[PDB]
């Protein structure tokens, strides 16, 4: 603790006084991941491996929930033409937790795949498929040109160029109504001031790379809107109570201890927050059981030392932490120098019952100094000498002897 004084002050010499050094570091031991037992696999291979898909005007929207999946065969193993992600780390997809996923199966030619990103402008990016700025998920694409193409062109899928206004996202357009530009009625067919909005794809093997068909499935992830379902095969271990360890609870992390819960909670409550808006309480995902979270690593390290030309003896002051439960220095934690103050436990100093004038302050009436084979002692600061004078009506004190005192006062300018 003499060497910890020089590291904070960044100086070679240490003067006489109390200095603040550092704070307590409690290293976590184990890791707790609680996950419920689900024997059902997610059917993500139904929408990925199917031959026939839908188009961009009306897609096939499937909901996948209450199962487990494997993203190592989708991401790590990759026989795919394009994988892209935006708001989620693509490496950590097997780690993180979400509620549900909405897969949209559609085929877009290779000239028009550059408009799939949040906040674009295009033919598909306005009147067909929009990505908002708060959209969260990934984009998976694959090259279908060696299978789904045709020499005379593939008319089985069609796409919408024209719409009257901007289409809201996550909405399918099934309307067969002819777009009317002017005041002439179209009567269901094309004509003067009438355009036919739904045209057919350009797909041929004889063209370039812009007309090549791509099967594109965009996944939609939802974070912290609900308790998670799909997740991944991370780990499942038993709880560790009354020990400071790392927490991972349904994707939400933390560091602290597990204690009992005396408060009445909602049965649908995943977790709850304290006055500091961080998680003080959590529900177990496997069975419905509630343990509180109280965080660790609180309190500072304060040192009490004289100058380096006097001695090497350093007293250590703990701040606000009770020392009955207990920096890498374990030597002064052995005991018998321990005195209890209001500010905390003071170790490395022998408490005496006398009352003197001190030098280095601590607090709460307890003050320390360097006195006499010499060691740092701590005591209560004296107020000066006590005088008991009798007072009556018939007594007066008039001084018969005078002196001249000269003092010195320094005011900076």
């Amino acid at each position: 603790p003499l060497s910890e004084t020089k590291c904070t002050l960044k100086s070679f010499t240490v003067e006489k006084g109390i200095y603040q050094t550092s704070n307590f570091r409690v290293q976590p031991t184990e890791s707790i991941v609680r996950f419920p037992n689900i024997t059902n696999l997610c059917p993500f291979d139904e929408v990925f491996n199917a031959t026939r898909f839908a188009s961009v005007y009306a897609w096939n929207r499937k909901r996948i929930s209450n199962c487990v999946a494997d993203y190592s065969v989708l991401y790590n193993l990759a026989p795919f033409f394009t994988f892209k992600c935006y708001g989620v780390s693509p490496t950590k997809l097997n780690d993180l937790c979400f509620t549900n996923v909405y897969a949209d199966s559609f085929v877009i030619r290779g000239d028009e795949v550059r408009q799939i990103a949040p906040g674009q402008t295009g033919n598909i990016a306005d009147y067909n498929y929009k990505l908002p700025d708060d959209f969260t998920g990934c984009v998976i694409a694959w090259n279908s040109n060696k299978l789904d193409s045709k020499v005379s062109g593939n008319y089985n899928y069609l796409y919408r160029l024209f719409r009257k206004s901007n289409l809201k996202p996550f909405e399918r357009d099934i309307s067969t109504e002819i777009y009317q530009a002017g005041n002439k009625p179209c009567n269901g067919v094309a004509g003067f001031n009438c355009y036919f909005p739904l045209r057919s794809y350009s797909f041929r093997p004889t063209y370039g790379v812009g007309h090549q068909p791509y099967r594109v499935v965009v996944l939609s992830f939802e974070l912290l809107h609900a308790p998670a379902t799909v997740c991944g095969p991370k780990k499942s271990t038993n709880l560790v109570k009354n020990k400071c360890v790392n927490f991972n609870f349904n994707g939400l992390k933390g560091t602290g201890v597990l204690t009992e819960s005396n408060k009445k909670f909602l049965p649908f409550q995943q977790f709850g927050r304290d006055i500091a808006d961080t998680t003080d309480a959590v529900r177990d995902p496997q069975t419905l059981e509630i343990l509180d979270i109280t965080p660790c690593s609180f309190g500072g390290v304060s040192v009490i030392t004289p100058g380096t030309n006097t001695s090497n003896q350093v007293a250590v002051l703990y701040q606000g932490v009770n020392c009955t439960e207990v920096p890498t220095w374990r030597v002064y934690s052995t005991g018998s120098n321990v005195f209890q103050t209001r500010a905390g436990c003071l170790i490395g100093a022998e408490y005496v019952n006398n009352s003197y004038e001190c030098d280095i302050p601590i607090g709460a009436g307890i003050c320390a100094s360097y006195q006499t084979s010499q060691s740092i002692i701590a005591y209560t600061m004296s107020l000066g000498a006590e005088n008991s004078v009798a007072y009556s009506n018939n007594s007066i004190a008039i001084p018969t002897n005078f002196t001249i005192s000269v003092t010195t006062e320094i005011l900076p300018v």
Epitope: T29, E30, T237, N238, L239, V240, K241, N242, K243, E260, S261, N262, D284, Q286, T287, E289, I290, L291
Partner: antibody, heavy 120, light 112 residues
Framework: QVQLQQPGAELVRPGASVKLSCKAS????????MNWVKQRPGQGLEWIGM????????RLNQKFKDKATLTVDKSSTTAYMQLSSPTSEDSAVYYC?????????????WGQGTLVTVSA | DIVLTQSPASLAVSLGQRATISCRAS??????????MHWYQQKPGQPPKLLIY???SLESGVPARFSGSGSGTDFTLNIHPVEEEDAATYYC?????????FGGGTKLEIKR
Amino acid sequence: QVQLQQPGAELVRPGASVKLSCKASGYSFTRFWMNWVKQRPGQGLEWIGMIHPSDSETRLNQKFKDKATLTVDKSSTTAYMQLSSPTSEDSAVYYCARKDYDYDAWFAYWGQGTLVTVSA
Amino acid sequence: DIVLTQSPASLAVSLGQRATISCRASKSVSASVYSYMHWYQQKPGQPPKLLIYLASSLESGVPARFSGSGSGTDFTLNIHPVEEEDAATYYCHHSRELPPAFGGGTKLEIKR
């Protein structure tokens, strides 16, 4: 099948130190905590102490302070209990138990038992 | 902590009746919906076994004649039908307060 193993009987004089062995198998040693249960006949069960084996941190009874010393061995997956200066009232039946933690802490598994007779 | 006291010390129940043995607590063990009590049965020369966890439930491997109920500081141990292999010491335990305590014990006999 997780089964805790203890020797049958130990003999020690008063004033000396005695050491006991609790062997864990079938499960990882640092993932649980170890509890020690004292049984004196006619009094009932008494609680000695509880130790996290990975951190080597002990939780002891207030009456049982400085009588018992709890150490572990992570290499052999075997927990130890060391007593300091036993008396004539300290002759009892000692157990070790694995505490599985989910919500409330039960006692899942037990040992074979050890009877320590303190006499000269 | 919480000191447990069971009454009476010995109980003689004939075959075909229902036994009731109470474990009383000094303070309330009820928290987080599920309070904290366990029931342990120990034969002489044998280690004890886990029987009832969280007072509404039954451990697998334990037969269905061993059951418990009660709320607050007054808990009941309901054993019925009584059989001749059921004679052993009964113990109760709370994990609520640190450091935890153990019960005094109650011996059950069969009156014939």
